[PDB]
């Protein structure tokens, strides 16, 4: 699971680590390609900028 939550009113947008803590869009991440193929049509708009 990876849950995109938008940052309301100027806050940072938000994805969730598998551990439980929500994490912002930075750093070094580890996808599987199956996870990309889950929602690639959503993820391109959410991640490409």
């Amino acid at each position: 699971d990876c849950r995109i939550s938008f940052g309301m009113n100027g806050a940072a947008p938000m994805i969730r680590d598998e551990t439980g803590m929500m994490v912002p869009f930075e750093g070094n991440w580890i996808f599987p390609l199956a996870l990309w193929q889950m929602n690639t049509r959503y993820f391109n708009q959410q991640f490409d900028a």
Partner: protein, 49 residues
């Protein structure tokens, strides 16, 4: 008495068995202001049960 109407016993269902269903009543505010258009999965046209 001489000949009886035989009844239809062995009957089949190839479709799914259920008896209930989930109908929507009032639609969601798919365009609005405080949330972007791309949060909603209907914008990316993914169907859902």
């Amino acid at each position: 008495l001489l000949h009886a109407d035989t009844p239809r016993l062995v009957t089949w269902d190839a479709g799914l068995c259920t008896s209930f269903k989930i109908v929507p009543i009032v639609p969601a505010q798919v365009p609005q202001d405080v949330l972007a258009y791309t949060f909603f999965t209907s914008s990316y046209a993914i169907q859902s049960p």
